A paper describes a structure:
We verified that the Mimivirus and M. chilensis predicted PAPs were able to perform polyadenylation. These proteins were not only active, but also intrinsically self-processive, generating >700 nucleotides long polyA tails. To elucidate the molecular basis of this processivity we determined the Mimivirus and M. chilensis PAP crystallographic 3D structures, which revealed two topologically identical subdomains with a nucleotidyltransferase fold. Thus, while other PAPs form heterodimers with processivity factors, the Mimivirus and M. chilensis PAP become processive upon homodimerization.
The Mimivirus R341 and M. chilensis Mg561 genes were reliably predicted to encode PAPs after two iterations of PSI-BLAST. The Mimivirus R341 protein exhibits a unique acidic extension of 65 residues at its C-terminal end (D5) and an insertion of 12 amino acids in its third subdomain (D3). The canonical acidic residues D94-E96-D143 are properly positioned and ordered in the crystal structure as evidenced by the 2Fo-Fc electron density maps contoured at 1σ on the of M. chilensis and Mimivirus PAP active sites. To further characterize the molecular determinants of the dimerization of Mg561 and the role of the dimerization on the polyadenylation activity, we made deletion of the Mg561 (ΔD1 Mg561) and R341 (ΔD1 R341) N-terminal domains. Gel filtration experiments revealed that the mutants were monomeric and although they still co-purified with RNA, they were inactive, suggesting that the dimeric state and the N-terminal domain were required for the polyadenylation activity. No association was observed between Mg18 and R341 confirming the specificity of the interaction.
Residue numbers in the entry:
A (entry chain A): 9 to 261, 275 to 360, 373 to 528
B (entry chain B): 9 to 261, 277 to 359, 369 to 527
Write the structure that this text describes.
Amino acid sequence: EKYQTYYTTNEYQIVKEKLPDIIRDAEIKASEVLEPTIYEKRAIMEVIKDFIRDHQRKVYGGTALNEALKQVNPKDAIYDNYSFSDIEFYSPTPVQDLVDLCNILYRKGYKFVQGKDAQHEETYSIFVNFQLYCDITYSPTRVFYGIKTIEIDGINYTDPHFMLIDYLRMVNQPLTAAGQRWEKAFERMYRLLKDYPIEDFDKRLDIPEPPEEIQSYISRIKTEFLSDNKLNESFLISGIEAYNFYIRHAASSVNLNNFIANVPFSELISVNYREDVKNTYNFLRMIVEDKEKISVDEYFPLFQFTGYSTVIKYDDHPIIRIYEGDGYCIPNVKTVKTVKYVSFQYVLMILYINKFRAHLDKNKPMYFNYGIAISNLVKARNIYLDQTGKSVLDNTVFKEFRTNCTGNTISFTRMNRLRLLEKRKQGKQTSFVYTPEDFFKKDLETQAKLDPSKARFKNTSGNKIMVPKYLLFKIDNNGNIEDNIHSEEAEISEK
Amino acid sequence: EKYQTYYTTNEYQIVKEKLPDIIRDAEIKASEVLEPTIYEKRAIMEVIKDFIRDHQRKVYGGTALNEALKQVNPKDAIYDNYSFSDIEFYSPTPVQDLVDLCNILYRKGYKFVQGKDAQHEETYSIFVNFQLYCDITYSPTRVFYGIKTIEIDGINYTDPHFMLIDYLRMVNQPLTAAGQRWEKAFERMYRLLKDYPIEDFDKRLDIPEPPEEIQSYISRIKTEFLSDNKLNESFLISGIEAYNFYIRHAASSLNNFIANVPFSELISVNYREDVKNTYNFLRMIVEDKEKISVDEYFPLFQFTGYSTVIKYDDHPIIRIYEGDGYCIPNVKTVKTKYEYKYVSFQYVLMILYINKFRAHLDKNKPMYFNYGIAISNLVKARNIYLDQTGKSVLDNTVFKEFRTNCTGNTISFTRMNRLRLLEKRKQGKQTSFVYTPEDFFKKDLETQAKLDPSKARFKNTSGNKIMVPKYLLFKIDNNGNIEDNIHSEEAEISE
């Protein structure tokens, strides 16, 4: 039983070394002779880049980042001219844009030009000759025009400090996005925060201190409500409260506690919202001097950055704003006294999100405060690690890439396949396809049947829910709170 | 204006270092809490592993290589410390197996149990609770039982020296498979060829020397036919001719590895034209043309295309293989009459194994032993050459591996898949087949009776001589000449 040895030492090493270079050298050859070639690629991309310029849409994802990193330093590019990179962009009329770009590309000669309804969140896809070229994402009117942009070659590239939200959004989903995203999202976050650094503001935090009646209720929610172990299970401390937490923890070892801010109201995230809101309401309705002063404001999700929210107000004063974290496992910090705070990268995330809410809400003082808060929170973390000689991975309060989280989460695939099956049972139309070649082989009567204006999307405006049939909660005549048996409807593509 | 620096030197490095470990530590957490969890995975996996044992199917790929590597070393295993893998197995009745395993799993309680048409190499898919668990691949009866297996826990795992064919099949497709496969296929080829090395045979090559007339008809194909620059464009020299080429080249400053060439084995990247042309040349160069006979053969599973043997007095002169749609890595030579293309070193090492398997199916025991000797000798030859020259598998030698230089118009897998699907879509041969037992069992016994998995057609990939003329690619007209047969597609039934 004699045997031969194919591959040895260091022959195996020799192969592993040159192998990715050879694979590259081969992909180069493949791109210059296999259809679609690198030139067909370049051609379609410039056709789409022209359309974005024309309708003035907002480009995000890899394409915006690459373009932006390059405006600063071409060496900091995340793409090669061999990259078959997806050009993603935001649009308030996405299905109409899909039909236009699909027509334009078909007319230009290409095949097989196809416009599909993608798996992901209110995104549509354009494929040309079995190759995905771009993705059109629905952005509600309100959100859309509020997005800060940077201009390059007459194209609106989503502000680097806005794209940053989405990158933190990745690191802030440890169970559903650690494998598939944390490697690229860290690498990209690095270059983005290198070429577009976080600003340094010497300006003071000017958050108005509220009245004593309110000031006591905000405090008594922490001391009396959030202490009850059968009540605080699903709560996570966000807002200026959480901000101050990291601000205080930065003192533990030019220019002191001076970064501390007046807490204007509580901002909490619940991983069991409907139960936790009703419970906060009933607690305030018990601890409040004249219960008929209590009012409840609800808000739609802010784009794709938050879920629903509810503000409980006493004399039109916000006491607490509760956010819906249902379906998410939020990375959190543990201390817990004596005789749950959202993670450092989560607060750094919400601060940016809240700054954007302010911008949409037209609120200029809050828009300036969040910006100050971010700068201060970053100054705070840096000086702490400088004084302690620590790292973003050492078990500190400012630790990054946390796996430890609160809440029952579900993988993207699961979330996508379940949502699809729900709307499939509803008959809200599963997959939408547009093949201009096939569409134009059809009569003008059938061609007339297609209307992109008649397309519905989830209301993700961040706007106060006015109409009661869209409100999640109901206030009964006795003054109590109840789960509203409503219609979870949203909005048409008619702008 | 004055900015802050988030992430520095060597803070960026620090992150890149621990990051894949953290991602791993996170995937561990995700695997212990996200439905379906490993406590649902291993349940479904063991149900399928039981079915494979029952019907005695042949497991291949990653799962198979893993367990085989494991039976010799569990440290040299490919899938790591319960890294979720895909079940892939061969079956002569795959659609019936799909319906059985889909029923069994549904009855066992699970949802959503679904059996899809995978859209590949006559492969079918089983998903349970939005998670792909296994893939069933169609293997014709003839091929199926000829596959040498290794038994572990009453399950038939595909012989490592057979799986090797598929791994070489990957490195032998440089334009369509270099990016997506050459990294894993090399790593796996290494660990397979170390835990299951290539045998060492001291036995002599006993290939019978053919008649002086037959050898004369063979030689004149090389001189008078393959020299003509308007004829030899699509030809590639395979078989013992190519084998001998690498045997002679290993001995360049007892040359006993040389073999009698029993006949020419050629691969054409323009087969129908190149076959008719060989036939017509031989019909002119031959003494009495009525002694010329033509034997055709179906593709041998997924290892070859169609073949044609041109025989003079029932003696094989030349066997031509169909390489249409493939870009074969080669080594061009120039006798200066000039151009001669030999199939790459790893391509001959590949066909030798494929030919040894053909012999096994053809029951031919002397050829089954000769190919085995040839492989051993060809490997002995390459090793001793690199030992004498101090060279590597990547240096520009005749025995160079991972070649990019190839002959023939190829098309990317995606293109081949989407075009094949569109061709059968126009034919109405059914695009995507779905089985949802939950939905199927909500239906009446009359509709339930309509579903028959025995009535499923597959491409005839037996490697068998084409007997019936309506399945023959060529026709011999009364005048004695060759013609393209205007026949029907060879779709054998599952039964």
